[PDB]
Amino acid sequence: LEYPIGTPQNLAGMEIAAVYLQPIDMEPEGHMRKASESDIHIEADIHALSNNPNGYPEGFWVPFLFIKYEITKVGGSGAPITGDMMAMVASDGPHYGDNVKLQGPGKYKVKYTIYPPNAKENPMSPYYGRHTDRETGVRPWFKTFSVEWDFTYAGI
Amino acid sequence: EYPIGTPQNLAGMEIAAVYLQPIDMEPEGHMRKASESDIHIEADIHALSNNPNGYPEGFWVPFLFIKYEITKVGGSGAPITGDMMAMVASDGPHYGDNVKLQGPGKYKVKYTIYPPNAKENPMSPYYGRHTDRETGVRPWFKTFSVEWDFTYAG
Ligand SMILES: [Cu+]
Ligand SMILES: [Cu+]
Incomplete structure (x- = not known):
């Protein structure tokens, strides 16, 4: 099932929502x-x-x-759980996701750092372009930013 | 914004071939x-x-x-080949490339469309598909080609 995380946030003409599901199976394995x-x-x-x-x-x-x-x-002085999401498609459409191992039931804070197509850290920079001519061009990509929420994990 | 023939419905997608004047793009x-x-x-x-x-x-x-x-059509030169690149323009994301043709006249235009997991697709390690019963989708479509007639006005 779905477990939404807080309320969506917006920036630079995009809505950013956080959610978690049960762990999934994906190609490529x-x-x-x-x-x-x-x-x-x-x-x-x-x-x-x-x-x-x-x-x-x-x-x-x-x-x-x-x-x-x-x-x-929350309240932990231990190392944060970190990772990179991957772009993927599911029955509801495309999204960014990752399977994650948590540290038991309780309160967590979740931060997403969102990199634009042309960011150094984004491995997809050489694969996605942006028109820049007057007739069909668009504005520059947004700059890297972060968004945070709190959530409770009960165990699914 | 100019059409190459009419769009074709294939593999659960509308595939249209269009063109416009050559553009400028980031990354260089x-x-x-x-x-x-x-x-x-x-x-x-x-x-x-x-x-x-x-x-x-x-x-x-x-x-x-x-x-x-x-x-x-009837040309003695080598066919013009290339790869498109994914990109965005004022009317949204598309696949495109700047092309030099071989003068005004009749051409055949063929696109070969590769799914995310094709050997030929360099983006295969970057895009996944859920396969579980609850949220999964069917396998990616099979690589296919689509062709149209094109008259270049010059
Ligand atoms: Cu996913
Ligand atoms: Cu383009």
Whole structure:
């Protein structure tokens, strides 16, 4: 099932929502930590709002982003749980996600750092372009930013 | 914004071939210089109803790889070949390339459309598909080609 995380946030003509599901299985295998080695599938749900700066019609999935996440158990002085999401498709459409192993039931904080197509850290920079001519060009890509939420994990 | 024939409904997607004047793009070094090209050729690919790879109708189909072959009818030159690149423009994301043609006249335009997991698709390690019963989708479509007749006005 789905376990939404807080309320969606917006920036730069995109809506950013966080949710987790039960761990999933994915092709290509050997990318997702196996479902049996995980507690949840964390996801970032990112869609264009109106007047999107890069030409996306409202509602379109925003592709070719790179998302790094940090999940910290509240009150914990231990190391945060970190990883990189991967772009993928599921029955509900494309999203960014990762299978994650948590640190038991309780309160967590979740931070997503969202990299644009042209960020150094985004491995997809050489594969996705942007028109820059006057007639068909669009605005520059957004700059890297982070968004945070709190959530409770009960065990699924 | 100019059409190459009419769109074809294939593999749960509308595949349209269009073109416009040569463009400029970030990142540099992928498109041929606009001044050294004749057109920007594009593949406009969106999901139809009941798309089997998880896309709601009208969505752009991302992470594909498109190779094109443009042949002048009766031409003695080599066919014009290349790879499109995914990119965004004012009307949305598409696949495109700046192309130099071989003068005005009749051409055949063929696109070979590769799914995310094709050997030929360099984006295969970057795009996944859920396979579990609850949230999975059907296997990626099989690589296919689509052709049209094109008259270049010059
Ligand atoms: Cu996923
Ligand atoms: Cu383009």
